[PDB]
Paper text:
MATs are an essential and ubiquitous enzyme family found in all domains of life. 38 MATs catalyze the condensation of ATP with methionine to generate S‐adenosylmethionine (SAM)—an essential molecule involved in numerous biological processes, including RNA, DNA, protein and small molecule methylation, polyamine synthesis, and production of enzyme cofactors. 39 Analysis of available crystal structures reveals that bacterial MATs are predominantly dihedral homotetramers (D2 symmetry group), that is, comprised of dimers of dimers 40. Two deep cavities harboring active sites are located directly in this dimeric interface, making the homodimer the obligatory functional unit.
Further, whereas the small interface of NgMAT has no salt‐bridges, the small interface of EcMAT contains eight: Lys98 in each EcMAT subunit forms a salt‐bridge network with Asp64 and Glu67 of the opposing subunit. 26 To explore this hypothesis, we generated two reciprocal mutants, swapping the salt‐bridge‐forming residues in the EcMAT small interface (Lys98 and Glu67) with those of NgMAT (Gln98 and Lys67), and vice versa. Additionally, we solved the crystal structure EcMATmut at 1.6 Å resolution and found that the protein assembles into a homotetramer that is highly structurally similar to EcMAT. PISA analysis of the small EcMATmut interface revealed that its hydrophobicity (ΔG i /area) increased by approximately 30% compared to that of EcMAT (11.8 vs. 9.0 cal/mol/Å2, respectively), whereas the net per‐residue electrostatic contribution (ΔΔG elec) of EcMATmut was comparable to that of NgMAT. Following purification of the E. coli mutant (EcMATmut) and the N. gonorrhoeae mutant proteins, we determined that the removal of the salt‐bridges did not affect the catalytic activity of EcMATmut, while the addition of salt‐bridge‐forming residues to NgMAT resulted in substantial aggregation. Removal of the salt‐bridges did not change the kinetic stability of the tetrameric complex. Strikingly, while at equilibrium the tetrameric fraction of EcMAT constituted 30%, the tetrameric fraction of EcMATmut was only 5%. Based on these measurements we calculated the tetramer‐dimer equilibrium dissociation constant, K d (see Section 4) and determined that the K d of EcMAT was approximately 11‐fold lower than that of EcMATmut (8.2 vs. 90.3 μM, respectively). Interestingly, removal of glycerol from the incubation buffer resulted in a dramatic and increasing aggregation of the dimeric fraction of EcMATmut, which, led to a loss of over 90% of the tetrameric fraction after 120 hr of incubation. We found that the rate of SAM accumulation by EcMATmut is approximately 60% lower than that of EcMAT.
Numbering used by the authors:
A (entry chain A), B (entry chain A), C (entry chain A), D (entry chain A): 3 to 99, 111 to 388
């Protein structure tokens, strides 16, 4: 019997604004130069975006237009909301100053995770936290609730009973909105259009507490309310705290940065082990030394749910997966402008991303000797 | 049998520069106004520091002098190193626009952890990673190795055998340095002055791999090499990945921000459970809803090492600890300028910090009914 | 027979926005510390104000609130106008690191001028250019023309016939406005409310050309349209080109800066010579060497209109006026927060400023031996 | 009998640093796109360059490399001098969002001047002020005085006797320098290498005062000492105060901006009148209305030195010169990357610039009927 909690934030949360600008700049560069080196760090606050860092590329991009386009899409288009794509400041401080045996670009450690408690092999709490804010954005943009504004957060507390979901104990939904909607109207609409359509009714009972805009009015937000920086939502981006984290941010980094590529690979590995039926849950840790191709370490954790000995799993992983930094890029077909889409609503659990394919599961299952004997 | 890896970075790593500026600004404010509200986000890169965010305070501080003093102390005092305290740009964009029942200032989730694998009740990998970079800084500043420069990283891979440390498998030490030292000289000096004095000789064997400045020369660094931002080393700041993380950054936040205060409290709770002998390792999760005083959730995880039933532990925690946001500040005496010291070499494991006191351990032990029966 | 032209700009022109922020910061400091050293340079463009330079002061000022207050007063309060006081970025980069024999703080040259072609002893073209934009601001702010927006420019071409004003040949008035007013409506209203009430009807004839918003619609302006910097309207600030200029900017400089104080003194000198009847027009040049109290040069130019020999005038000036840098501050009572008012609509010709007093005129006249002999 | 004073500043003065960055960016764009629209405003101070404004161009330029290259050429290459090309911050905030009948892009007024008191038809004071700082830069860069640093100023006071140069009354030379040179050594070297080789010995007498580094040591300078902005040396750029000024800055503006093109044209006109022998000195004023091709006014001032009636001169100017904004660009062949060279040591008096050609002088002389009758 334990209570576990995860959160997510909408595309209009200031940290998420920064992540999406960083990745919109990455995508624009990769469209022209797939092998670009990009380390693009964004900082947003009242009236301004600062886009900085380092790029090595043949590409020619307009950082200001990409930034303004990104903010406009998120929905900040007027001073009444606290922030305007068309009239904010955009400052740029980007410095433009056998292949599988290439060393890691940096040291570090990265984790990946999978669990069969959902069909996408993700933890339920982060899954439903993301779906809530993704729903908030959908009913804002489609005109179902046209008074919604871009900045929102969600938080879901699940109840477990020896590792089985019993229900949802608590739900937090805080949304920005225009001045005209009153709080009772806002709470009813958020319950009917956002919460009830996303959370399974089975998990919602008399024991469920709902905190909808628990401080009431939330008119001013996005960067006016809170400074936002790239890489400040790394637990929202991953597994909502259910799994460990190595500390590296994803957004604004090209696929040569093992902080992103090896975390994607570790998800792919974990997900294929669980899809194979070789465990019910699996956490992978990998680590690198700058200038060294072979990871300094690989760890496979199955929390006692493995269907074959743990040492045999570690072997299967070395056998089927090339975790050298350029083996990663090959393994996942990463040199394409696919990253802006990851930079809100989570890097995992959306099954069109290359690191969410379970195209190794039968291979691992066969290689492990799992198959039924008769008679 | 598993390999686990943690890293740390010196006070001269650009992300750590940002953390220390943010907390130097917090301390300067709390010295004058202990109840200040501070959310100070720093961004450093080639030639500049940007210090931004939001403060509510009666204090009057010189952000530029605090910044320059902080960078000078870290050791960046010349263009030859890539960055100069005295001549860099400092830009400021800080907007200055029953008490225990006060609501949390934000939603979120926070973890704390303790393990008796070290005397300070920390995981060994993060402990020894921090000690390595702390040693690098000490031999740089005391003139033992005067050619060292401020930017460094460490990484240590431990070998476990069913949860007992067998040894150290791999050690990474990457340090900045002046142009005059050659790499063989640098590797010998780092082995003799930094590595061998910090890592127990028992754990160092023929199986131990050493990667000292594995890309060779590292003359240019700090902000010139890599943009740095507040809150981009949250796993170095905590448990090196051994424990989970809720995603919140510590530095530049006053103690009313549950991202910092509740993580400190969760460490205090976990550490006192383990010091009490109520478990060998303990992870606490807590979460809040904005405007709500009582946490939305509390979870006590003991990984099967508890000495009393798990439900009884959850009770002991509600009984002995007030996890309401202002109960935290009272519980830990937090309204003092003590934070710059946390902003490099880890927020945990240094036992003079208030959240590292084990002043509840005997209390919890007595309350749990642990004591020996004779005859 | 010659045509001469001068321009002026409203308080909402971006260069004038910068001047007024610089001087609002100066005034706020002098209110607390009359002997402050201030060199405050402002830069405005789309979404941002940067306030920089150097101050030596005991004062404690909130640069962000002063900036936002200044922009709000000018009238930029919405993204629809291109700029919002409440939601723009404000960045600060101000470094806070016998008395009459004190040296000049810098070298330089400064001119002052007076002419009896107006009652305020100013050239008519700059006088009427300022009055036009000052009128534009008055009918905008008083609701006479509520659709006006803050950014405007004026330009007036006078016809002279051997140095006597014959009339006005050309009038330019370009004003920002809201989207709702059509251009014919705007032209009629500007002619009736701004032009006809300010320019003497005697000077307006069939030969007069009027260019009112000659490019038509002007909805977007202020910083969105044009970057603005302190000290980029030095000819609008002075004599509209009728007199020479030494190149120094006024705004954001305390009275120890001879670029401001000696130009004010040179106006005072010229104005008192002309008010004395010792010439009909008078241009003064003074210059300084850094660290030298006595000006390196003084020149008195009367364009052949002197009523006493030129050498005798130069003597009268050395006799009645102390042009040493601290003699200036004493001569004009300058250590008071009086400067924001100078930073739009001209530093000269408004007779409540201390350098516009003619309290030496009778003294100079008596000392020159001008007085009527009878019989 | 009158004393007149002019100043100049070296390429390392912070305002001049800004002018040269603005024009280096203009040149880089015009090299690729001769018809680019450019309005590039620079701001330099401790540790940073901000390059902003508005460009309409097909060109692709690296603002950061152009900036760093420009600062390096000027000579700021180390923190010991206060500023380093290689390690300063560069921030960019440039928004990239019958032909002779095209309207002026803005209103305004512009002056041009010529006088036969020098062979280049410039006033002597500005001529010799520029030559002094140009000499300071030459002996710094050629290693004659290798301890010189980039920031310097000059100021020269000439004595006139009814409009004829009698001599030089005062000379100011303030130069930055390294820590190693003492002030007596510096004064002797500046007198021998900079002053005596540039100023005619005839003009230097017992009455001449010399102020060499009159405040002594000047080690820290460039942007560390003083914020610099584009367009803050408009009187150094033109005629040193001898002639009037319309207020417009030159640097960072493409030739479609009448603030630059019409001032260049007005110099060309004045210079060709004086070279023709139609006056000994000539000041031209022109002015424009936004969206109007024909200037709102033209004024020809000859200070009583004309050799033909004044009305006939005004006619000659309308006849020989097309002052419509695109007539200017054609008249002077302006669509070429020639502007960085203007942005230090004066826009006039260097006779390879297109507006310094006297290719109309014989034409004007013939058209005026000036020629000798015999017998
Ligand atoms: N030549 C070099 N050799 C070795 N290490 C180097 C070298 N140059 C820089 N580094 C280090 O590499 C560091 C990068 O650390 P880190 O902040 O983790 O990078 P990041 O890519 O921004 N990721 P994170 O902030 O963790 O998401 C630099 O800041 C230096 O400490
Ligand atoms: N009136 C309000 N009511 C509720 N939520 C609000 C209100 N105002 C702002 N918020 C939200 O609170 C958010 C803060 O999120 P977060 O980024 O986690 O904060 P942080 O303190 O910088 N911590 P982190 O970046 O996680 O270390 C804002 O950006 C909004 O989404
Ligand atoms: N110690 C010093 N001795 C002499 N001159 C110095 C010293 N320190 C700096 N200076 C010079 O003084 C200059 C100031 O020039 P200037 O740009 O005219 O100043 P300003 O006050 O901004 N006025 P302006 O831009 O003309 O309105 C510096 O930039 C240096 O060239
Ligand atoms: N559509 C428009 N119609 C008319 N005037 C306009 C329009 N858009 C902007 N303007 C004005 O044109 C001004 C330009 O003034 P000014 O500051 O003299 O320009 P500049 O080119 O930077 N020159 P200076 O600072 O004088 O060297 C703008 O700031 C507005 O007042
Ligand atoms: K923040
Ligand atoms: K970075
Ligand atoms: K401009
Ligand atoms: K300045
Ligand atoms: Mg945040
Ligand atoms: Mg990292
Ligand atoms: Mg980093
Ligand atoms: Mg948070
Ligand atoms: Mg301007
Ligand atoms: Mg000056
Ligand atoms: Mg200046
Ligand atoms: Mg102009």
């Amino acid at each position: 019997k334990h209570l576990f909690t995860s959160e997510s934030v909408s595309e209009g949360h200031p940290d998420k604004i920064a992540d999406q600008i960083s990745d919109a700049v990455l995508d624009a560069i990769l469209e022209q130069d797939p092998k670009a080196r990009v380390a693009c760090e964004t900082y947003v606050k009242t009236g301004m975006v600062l886009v900085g860092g380092e790029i090595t590329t043949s590409a020619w991009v307009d950082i200001e237009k990409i930034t303004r386009n990104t903010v406009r899409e998120i929905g900040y288009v007027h001073s009444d909301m606290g922030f305007d794509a068309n009239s904010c400041a955009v400052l740029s401080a980007i410095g433009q100053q056998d292949p599988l045996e290439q060393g890691a670009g940096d040291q570090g450690l990265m984790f990946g995770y999978a669990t069969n408690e959902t069909d996408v092999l993700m933890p339920a709490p982060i899954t439903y936290a993301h779906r809530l804010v993704q729903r908030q954005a959908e009913v804002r943009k489609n005109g179902t609730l046209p008074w919604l504004r871009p900045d929102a957060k969600s938080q879901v507390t699940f109840q477990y009973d020896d590792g089985k979901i019993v229900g949802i104990d608590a739900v937090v939904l805080s949304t920005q909105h225009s001045e005209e909607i009153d709080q009772k109207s806002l709470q009813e609409a958020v319950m009917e259009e956002i919460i009830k359509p996303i959370l399974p009714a089975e998990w919602l009972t008399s024991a469920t507490k709902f905190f909808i805009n628990p401080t009431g009015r939330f008119v001013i937000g996005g960067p006016m309310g809170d400074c936002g920086l790239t890489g400040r939502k790394i637990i929202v981006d991953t597994y909502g705290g259910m799994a460990r984290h190595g500390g590296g941010a994803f957004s604004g980094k090209d696929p040569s940065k093992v902080d992103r590529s090896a975390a994607y690979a570790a998800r792919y590995v974990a997900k294929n082990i669980v899809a194979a039926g070789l465990a019910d849950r699996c956490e992978i840790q990998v680590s690198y030394a700058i200038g060294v191709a072979e990871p300094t370490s690989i760890m496979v954790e199955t929390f006692g749910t493995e269907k074959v000995p743990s040492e045999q799993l570690t072997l299967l992983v070395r056998e089927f997966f090339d975790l050298r930094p350029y083996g990663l890029i090959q393994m996942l077909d990463l040199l394409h402008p696919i990253y802006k889409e990851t930079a809100a609503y989570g890097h995992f659990g959306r099954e069109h991303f290359p690191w969410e394919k379970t195209d190794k599961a039968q291979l691992l299952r066969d290689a492990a000797g799992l198959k039924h004997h008769h008679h």
